[PDB]
Amino acid sequence: SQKNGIATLLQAEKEAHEIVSKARKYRQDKLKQAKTDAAKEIDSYKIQKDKELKEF
């Protein structure tokens, strides 16, 4: 059980490290997404102002 037990440890540690990295990956990706989904809101509001500026 010497290398079976160590095998258990080694595999668990790879698996923990990867789940936590997946949540960290998720945070990077959401902050970039925030930067993206704010870029969309700006130019729909600007063209709204362009539309009623054209009425003048």
Next chain:
Amino acid sequence: QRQVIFECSKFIEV
């Protein structure tokens, strides 16, 4: 430091 590697690779091989 050589011996604590020789006596701890053996513990994993057991």
